[PDB]
Design a protein around this ligand. Structure first.
Ligand SMILES: [Mg+2]
Ligand SMILES: [Mg+2]
Ligand SMILES: [Mg+2]
Lengths: 125, 233, 196, 222, 195, 204, 212, 226, 195, 196
């Protein structure tokens, strides 16, 4: 299998592939989150360079991970689908074994763990 | 219930125009060991019947003693013991068939397959089979054990149905029997080269031939056979 | 089966009957049980016909590949390859093989490999179901350094008796003579050996 | 271990007409894949206008028939030569069979004849003696091949009158002796084609007020 | 476990399941709910070998819940039943098969029709007006064959169900400690708390 | 215990003049218990018809499998599969499970769209092809079906006459089998029309 | 097999199917599962056909000998016990029976005894025996009353066998009905299940699951 | 099943009966047991019928690819070696019992193969349930230097012995002749000694005899335009 | 059959026996009386293999009735129990043994004492204050060990018996269809028709 | 066991080894397997030691009672009494007996009675587990009308080989000579017969 170390340190102590991944996030459409006293609101930007779009069927920017947790993102759209799928599977796995839905902190900790793993695994970016 | 110990293999037989022929080899096997080489398995009763027996030899010797006692008993207070009131093939068979079925019904069988060959008072050919289960049947050709699988097919090519019997001479019938015995020697691992053959004819009576051998065998072609596939030398 | 191999002054001779059985039915009356794994290394087969054919074919392959790399193999080497297959696959095999060969350095040699997969080097060897009936005869009549004609008679008389008593053995007596002169095949028919 | 039973194959068929009855059976006798005989009679005239067949294990079959024939003989001795009626014969055979309830005759028995009103009669038995009067009954190896055909062609099952579409059944009209024999021959010809133990010959025994008549027909010998 | 029944009426599906759980000699529990909600309008009851039953039911539940989140859409009862059948058909040739029989009662919101599916541990699926597993059908089907109509109300279905349970309580040797009854219709799933 | 007779059922197929017929009962059971009277055993992929008797889970599984395979066949080949080719696909598919087989008795029936020739075939559970000119039988009452077909059948029957022959063959065979019946269906198949008829029969 | 018998105001109803099978093969559709022991006593056939036939006609002989010696009709209690005591002697040997001995006398009234080959002898009001017994019990239990008329009781017995014949693979063929009175039993005909099913479906409105 | 193989002057002939059985029932009355491995290498099979075809086609397929790879016509010893090694690997579980015959640049050949992988060489061979009936005929009438006409006669006579005397065999005789320097001639139904006699009665029903509940047209056509 | 209980109080013996009779799949009867009166002051309940139970009980009954006529005298409960034990002890080494367990409750008119004897099919006899056969003791003995007193009244004995039956109805898997209760005292044998 | 009986010019000689085993343990190394049922009618025993001793004791009783009434019995008569016991009780017996005797009218005779209970009159007979290994040797070396010294050598050499190959046979070689002159017992020790 392809084992090449793509994420590595540089002389100044930086991992450029992780830093260039942030530059992809900078390019993505803006997303914002605000929590009130008894609610949280997620706002998202849709670039109007694309009209003649079918808004019924086009992938929405906010995604339900479970009935009580949502996820939005900025960056590569195709990459986000892989994180969303993994998160949804883990949410159902937690309900099955612990007999209780995930806390928001647990779901975040899982997704963040997947992202970290892809920064020191061979053959992946 | 028992198991057969010392055993005899095929008995073969057929009808022809004026009578019947029956044959069986002279071997008494002990499993795969060809132990006894001088065993007579055709036993004549009077001058009109020959009983051929396969299977357990100890039980054969018992049956042989029953037939011997049957002849003695029939002669008692019987002025026509050597004439009108002599033992018929049909009398001898029915007696044996009764014994075989009774013994299987007590769960203690005589472990044999028997063929009674003979000629009746009126000249009619008699040929019928009975075994350890008491099962009986008649046919223009009859054979036991391996003979059933290999001899019958050859003998049935001569006499295929009832109407073929008057068309079959004693020379043609004996020829077919002798050939069948050769084929059995080629292919039955519990057979021997030495055998006995008996003819019961309505005109010439009972002819009993001992110490016959399988002859005119084909083996020469064996020299050309090498290996099991690819080997040339 | 009745099989045997006998060393003598000029080399070694292998002998065998030709009967193959499935129960009491003789499935083949003219079988060749003397099999060639190398020019002057042959074997006698007893047990499962499938197993001994599969083994002999593999050994023939091994010795052909040995020859291409290291030159002619010894009879001991051929016996070892047979043993390796029989021993390591003892749970799944039913094979009793006698290996016989002629070198110029070692002359005639005989190795017997029974069921378990052990090896035994002997002056002569007997095997197969029919061999049981001639242990007495062979032990009394074998001499070392016999002539070709004496060895042929010893094997002919021995297998004749094995055939006479064993229902599983029969047919023709095949023989293969291994000497410096080359490889000679012999055959003896029932009318010949039965009257002995 | 010793097995006192065997299987001799064979197939038998009994049909009861209005004033007649037939009992047919193939003449082939077998064990495993071998043919013992191409002509071994299986249906027997037992006297008093009664025909009988005991199909299955031939040794038990021959024993039973022999004992019944004997029972007819002693019925005459003990009861002033009175004719043994088919119903009385049937009940007698039950007692012969049940007498060996715990070591049974391994056969399926069928008898045929005329009842005391002169009408056709067939009785069918299991190995241990349970019995029924029946109109149509096949027994033995190819019974499963023959009975569905008879249901359709004798009793006109699943046949309705054209135009009505299932509302009116095809009427059960009486069959002649010639018509029955045609159906018997076609039954055995079809059974011979598809069952390995059926073949060689077909022997039919016909029973009327005039007595017992026989007919024989060739079957395929393969 | 033991008795599970199902009946499809005009506008709903009714599932009835026994409450007893027996560990050989003793009855350990008399209030056990042998069912799982797969989706808002789909219910599955189950019976078979101990442990395997709940393990299988919860596994199916998790998979259907995962599908619902991914697509933001409820699968049809027919689609759910096919998924369940395939899992059991896969299971029967495994190293250790699931020994579980199920009934799937669902209301199809697209067609506005109730649907009842019977699936055994081999993966044998049939759509039925009424169904059962084990010996339950042997006692109840003669009553259902007589009284059942396709235009029955939910109340009439419950009454016919009571007659079935009464026959089970009379002629069955085992004490199954009554049944929990649940109704599946256009408004979802609810439990009849007095039966 | 015997997987091939747990659920019960039968299929029969016949040839006629420029036509074929395939028929089956509708019973599904759990041994003695009758479970369903609507379990059809005949499926079709384009103009090729497949009947399947035996273990019901495998009947359903194989239908789904051959639908899968004939759909991919059509997309790649750009034409519907023919009876002769489909027969080989069934045989291949069954033999790949040689030592863990589907417990079924499939029957193929159809007319070749190019030659117009009527075609039928049968298989054992392990893939062996029986390609008869006259008729094919399968199921728990196969013995009974062999008996009916062998006497009732004659060659070159017209479509409407063939319907009567195959219907009477099925019905009377099913009535002599405990695990068959509870309704029946007959397909009459011509080169470009297929008629499907449900039969009225005893429900015991 | 499905056989039933029940007590009611007008006596006893006995109803049976007609099918006999050897494995999956249907041997007969015209079997007689009611043994007519004598003009006053009936017995049903389940388990072993021969065992039931043989020993219940034998029972008739014993009953006939009893009334010759005692100049009085044998009681159902005494008749059933002669049979149960006989089969108990054979216990272990492999007899197979499940039968209802049915009768109506002065001293007892309508009486039914279930007799079994393992020795069981039970008096009762409703009995149902065979592979389709559970189906017939369902129809019986939900419709049975003591104050049924002879007409309605006969139908209930007919309908209960039909229920079994439909669902049980090893039951069917035809239905045989009997009504047992104090003056003897009365035969109420043979009814083909094929024809009976469609007739009942239409007239009753039952079996909506089946297309007709 | 009865199958035989007989060597002659300039080639080899194989033959077989045409009955296939499911226990005591005849499944197919005109079965084809002579299989083609390559144009001039044919084999007859007994035992598990699926196994004999499956193993014949697999080896036949690999033989064809081997022939294309080497630019040489296939040899019988190659078919033999590939068949026995395959069968040995499966330890008898693939129930194929074969008689393999053919002609190639080396000459004419005749072998038999057992399900466990054992092979043997001969001038005449027989396999199947009717092999003892067939071998009886072969042992009675075989000689050295048979002609083509004599070998076909002997082979078919041996199959007939199986047909008439073995219940496992029946119906017709199939033959295939493979002569050196010639095309192999496959003689399907070479003998037909078992035609059924005309029936006594016609069983054609009056139209409308069967009761029908529902009729409907089945849509076998694809989704239509417009 | 299934459950048979017995309890000896101050002045009487009380026997309780289940009413159900099950032929494998179905409950054929729910009113069966598993007892026989051997003599005016001696009652025997029984449970075991079908057929053997009644055959044995009636055989014993006939023998004790024969003794009563011959001597014009009622045997003591102790004497009857010994006779029964010997018959079972004889039976266990027979060709086909009686598979029957019994309880014998009697009132001895000479000693003016109630007596309860428990005998199993092997011929194992014990005199007890309370007893049972099969699995019945496993559920009931812990309650009897706690509440039983030798000076209990008949009414107190019946109440303790109700508590035992309630525990059986709660924890036993089989439905034994209640019990028939009978009392044996100085005045003879009577049945409690409401229980 | 290894046992044999051989007729010769002056009468008959019986031979036997002396080993009795329980599994691999030699329960008796000096057993006498040559048993007297009448003055000049002896037998050789193989199989169950209990069975053959019980049978021989019964036969000895039968022949003693025969002698008191009808005078000296024939060897054929003795064989028949053995057969009757072995045949009628075949289900419960494991016995292989060779009967040998000397008449003045009939001279030396040998009858062998295998497991089943059949009788076979022979010029010589071999039996027991060890006999399998000398079928070949005995068939090749037996002649009719041998001298006493030749017959002793034939038996000595034969049983020597049977002992050599059969683990169940061993110890001393016992022999009993039956002629008109009387009854002579012989014994041969391992140091003698092993070097043959
Ligand atoms: Mg044939
Ligand atoms: Mg039914
Ligand atoms: Mg030693």
């Amino acid at each position: 299998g392809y084992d090449r170390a793509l994420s590595i340190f540089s002389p100044d102590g930086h991992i450029f592939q992780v830093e260039y991944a942030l530059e992809a996030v900078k390019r993505g459409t803006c997303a914002v989150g605000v929590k009130g006293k008894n609610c949280v609101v997620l706002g998202c930007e849709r670039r109007s360079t694309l009209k003649l779009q079918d808004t019924r069927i086009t992938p929405s920017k906010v995604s339900k991970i479970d009935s009580h947790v949502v996820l939005s993102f900025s960056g590569l759209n195709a990459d986000s689908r892989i994180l969303i799928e993994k998160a949804r599977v883990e949410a159902q796995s937690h309900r099955l074994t612990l007999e209780d839905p995930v806390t928001v902190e647990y779901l975040t900790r899982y997704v963040a763990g997947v992202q970290q793993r892809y920064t020191q695994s061979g053959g992946v970016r | 219930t028992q198991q057969p110990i010392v055993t005899g293999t095929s008995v073969i037989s057929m009808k022809y125009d004026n009578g019947v022929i029956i044959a069986a080899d002279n071997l008494g096997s002990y499993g795969s060991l060809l132990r006894f080489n001088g065993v007579e398995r055709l036993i004549p009763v009077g001058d009109n019947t020959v009983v051929g027996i396969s299977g357990d030899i100890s039980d054969m010797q018992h049956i042989e003693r029953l037939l011997k006692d049957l002849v003695t008993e029939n002669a008692y207070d019987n002025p026509l013991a050597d004439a009108e009131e002599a033992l018929e093939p049909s009398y001898i068979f029915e007696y044996l068939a009764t014994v075989m079925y009774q013994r299987r019904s007590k769960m203690n069988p005589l472990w044999n397959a028997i063929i009674v060959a003979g000629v009746q008072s009126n000249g009619d050919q008699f040929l019928r089979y009975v075994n350890l289960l008491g099962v009986t049947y008649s046919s223009p050709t009859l054979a036991t054990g391996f003979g059933a699988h290999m001899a019958n097919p050859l003998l049935r090519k001569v006499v295929d149905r009832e109407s073929d019997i008057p068309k079959t001479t004693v020379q043609v019938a004996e020829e077919a029997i002798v050939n069948a015995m050769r084929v059995l020697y080629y292919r039955d691992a519990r057979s021997s080269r030495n055998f006995s053959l008996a003819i019961i004819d309505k005109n010439t009576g009972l002819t009993f031939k001992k110490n016959l051998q399988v002859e005119n065998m084909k083996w020469d072609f064996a020299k050309d056979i090498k290996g099991y596939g690819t080997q040339k030398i | 089966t009745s099989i045997m191999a006998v060393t003598f002054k000029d080399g070694v001779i292998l002998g065998a009957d030709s009967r193959t059985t499935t129960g009491a039915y003789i499935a083949n009356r003219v079988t060749d049980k003397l099999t060639r794994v190398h020019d002057k290394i042959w074997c006698c087969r007893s047990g499962s016909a499938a197993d001994t054919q599969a083994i002999a074919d593999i050994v023939q392959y091994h010795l052909e590949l040995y020859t291409s790399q290291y030159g002619t193999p010894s009879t001991e080497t051929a016996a070892s390859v047979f043993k390796e297959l029989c021993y390591e696959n003892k749970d799944n095999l039913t094979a009793g093989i006698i290996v016989a060969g002629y070198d110029d350095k070692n002359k005639g040699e005989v190795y017997t490999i029974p069921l378990g997969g052990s090896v035994h080097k002997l002056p002569y060897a007997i095997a197969g179901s029919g061999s049981t009936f001639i242990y007495g005869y062979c032990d009394k009549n074998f001499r070392e350094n016999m002539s070709k004609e004496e060895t042929v008679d010893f094997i002919k008389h021995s297998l004749s008796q094995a055939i006479k008593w064993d229902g599983s053995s029969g047919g023709v007596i095949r023989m293969v003579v291994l000497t410096a002169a080359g490889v000679e095949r012999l055959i003896f028919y029932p009318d010949e050996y039965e009257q002995l | 271990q010793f097995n006192p039973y065997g299987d001799n194959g064979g197939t038998i068929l009994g049909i009861a007409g209005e004033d007649f009855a037939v009992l047919a059976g193939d003449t082939r006798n077998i064990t495993d894949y071998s043919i013992n005989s191409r002509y071994e009679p299986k249906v027997f005239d037992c006297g008093d206008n009664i025909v009988m067949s005991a199909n299955g294990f031939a040794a038990d079959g021959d024993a039973l028939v022999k004992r019944f024939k004997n029972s007819v003989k002693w019925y005459h001795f003990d009861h002033n030569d009175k004719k043994l009626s088919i119903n009385s014969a049937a009940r007698n055979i039950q007692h012969l069979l049940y007498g060996k309830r715990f070591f049974p005759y391994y056969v399926h028995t069928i008898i045929a004849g005329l009842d005391e009103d002169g009408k056709g009669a067939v009785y069918s038995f299991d190995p241990v003696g349970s019995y029924e009067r029946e109109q149509c009954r096949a027994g033995g190896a190819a019974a499963s091949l023959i009975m569905p055909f008879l249901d359709n062609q004798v009793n006109f099952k699943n046949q309705y009158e054209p135009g009505t579409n299932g509302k009116v059944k095809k009427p059960l009209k009486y069959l002649s002796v010639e018509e029955v024999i045609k159906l018997v021959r076609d039954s055995f010809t079809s059974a011979t084609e598809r069952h390995i133990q059926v073949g060689d010959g077909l022997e039919i025994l016909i029973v009327t007020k005039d007595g017992v008549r026989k007919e024989f027909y060739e079957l395929k010998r393969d | 476990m033991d008795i599970i029944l199902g009946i499809r009426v005009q506008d709903s599906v009714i599932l009835a399941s026994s409450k007893a759980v027996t560990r050989g000699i003793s009855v350990l529990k008399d209030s056990d709910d042998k069912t799982r909600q797969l989706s808002p309008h789909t219910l599955m009851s189950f019976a078979g070998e101990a442990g395997d039953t709940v393990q299988f039911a919860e596994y199916i539940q998790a998979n259907i819940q995962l599908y619902s989140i991914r697509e933001d859409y409820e699968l049809s009862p027919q689609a759910v039943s096919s998924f369940v059948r395939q899992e059991l058909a896969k299971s029967i040739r495994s190293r250790r098969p699931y020994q579980v029989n199920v009934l799937i009662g669902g209301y199809d919101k697209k067609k506005n029709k109730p649907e009842l599916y019977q699936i055994d541990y081999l993966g044998t699926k049939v759509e039925l007006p009424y169904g059962a597993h084990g010996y339950s059908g042997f006692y109840t089907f003669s009553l259902l064959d007589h009284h059942y109509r396709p235009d029955m109300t939910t109340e009439e279905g419950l009454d016919l169900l009571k007659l079935c349970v009464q026959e089970l309580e009379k002629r069955m040797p085992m004490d199954f400690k009554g049944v929990i009854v649940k109704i599946v219709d256009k408004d979802g799933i609810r439990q009849v708390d007095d039966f | 215990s015997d997987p091939s007779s747990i659920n019960g059922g039968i299929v029969v197929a016949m040839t006629g003049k420029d036509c074929v017929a395939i028929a089956c009962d509708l019973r599904l059971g759990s041994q003695s218990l009758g479970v369903s009277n609507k379990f059809e055993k005949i499926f079709h992929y384009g103009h090729v018809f497949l009947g399947i008797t035996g273990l019901a889970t495998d009947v359903t599984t194989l239908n789904e499998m051959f639908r899968y395979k004939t759909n991919l066949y059509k997309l790649k080949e750009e034409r519907a599969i023919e009876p002769e080719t489909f027969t080989q696909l069934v045989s291949s598919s069954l033999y790949e499970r040689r030592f863990g087989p589907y417990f079924v008795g499939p029957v193929v029936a159809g007319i070749n769209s190019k030659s117009g020739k009527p075609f039928i075939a049968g298989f054992d559970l392990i893939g062996c092809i029986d390609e008869a000119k006259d008729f094919i039988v399968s199921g728990t009452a196969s013995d009974q079906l062999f008996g009916m077909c062998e006497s009732l059948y004659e060659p070159n029957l017209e479509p409407e006459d063939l319907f009567e022959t195959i219907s009477q063959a099925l019905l009377n065979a099913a009535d002599r089998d405990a695990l068959s019946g509870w309704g029946a269906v007959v397909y009459i198949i011509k080169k470009d029309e297929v008629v499907k008829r449900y039969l009225k029969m005893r429900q015991d | 097999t499905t056989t039933l018998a029940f007590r009611f105001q007008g006596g006893i109803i006995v109803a049976v199917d007609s099918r006999a099978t050897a494995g999956n093969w249907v041997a007969s559709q015209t079997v007689k599962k009611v043994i007519e022991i004598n003009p006053f006593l009936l017995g049903t056939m389940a388990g072993g056909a021969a065992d039931c036939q043989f020993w219940e006609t034998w029972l008739g002989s014993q009953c006939r000998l009893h009334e010759l010696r005692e100049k009085e009709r044998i009681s159902v209690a005494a008749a059933s016990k002669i049979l149960s005591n006989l089969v108990y002697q054979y216990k272990g040997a492999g007899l197979s029976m499940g039968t209802m001995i049915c009768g109506y006398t002065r001293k007892e009234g309508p009486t039914i005894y279930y007799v079994d080959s393992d020795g069981t002898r039970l008096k009762g009001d409703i009995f149902c025996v065979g592979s389709g017994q559970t189906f017939a019990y369902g129809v019986l239990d939900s419709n049975y009353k003591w104050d049924l008329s002879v007409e309605d009781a006969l139908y209930l017995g007919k309908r209960s066998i039909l229920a079994a014949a439909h669902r049980d693979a090893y039951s069917g063929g035809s239905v045989n009905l009997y009504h047992v009175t104090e003056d003897g039993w009365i035969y109420h005909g043979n009814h083909d299940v094929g024809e009976l099913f469609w007739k009942v479906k239409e007239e009753e409105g039952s079996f909506n699951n089946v297309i007709g | 099943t009865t199958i035989v193989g007989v060597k002659f002057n300039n080639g080899v002939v194989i033959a077989a009966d045409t009955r296939s059985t499911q226990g005591p029932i005849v499944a197919d009355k005109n079965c084809a047991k002579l299989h083609r491995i390559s144009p001039k290498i044919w084999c007859a099979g007994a035992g598990t019928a699926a196994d004999t075809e499956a193993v014949t086609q697999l080896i036949g397929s690999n033989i064809e690819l081997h022939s294309l790879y080497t630019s040489r016509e296939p040899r019988v010893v190659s078919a033999l070696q590939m068949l026995k090694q395959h069968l040995f690997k499966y330890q008898g579980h693939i129930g194929a019992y074969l008689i393999v015959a053919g002609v190639d640049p080396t000459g004419s050949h005749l072998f038999s193969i057992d399900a466990h992988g054992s092979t043997d060489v001969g001038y005449y061979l027989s396999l199947g349930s009717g092999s003892l009936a067939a071998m009886a005929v072969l042992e009675s009438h075989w000689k050295q230097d048979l002609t083509k006409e004599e070998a076909i006669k002997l082979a078919s006579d041996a199959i007939q012995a199986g047909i008439w005397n073995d219940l496992g065999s029946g119906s017709n005789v199939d033959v295939c002749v493979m002569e050196i320097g010639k095309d192999a001639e496959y003689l399907r139904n070479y003998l037909t000694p078992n035609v059924r006699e005309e029936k006594q009665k016609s069983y054609k029903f009056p139209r409308g005899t069967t009761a029908v509940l529902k009729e409907s047209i089945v849509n076998i056509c694809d989704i239509q335009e417009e």
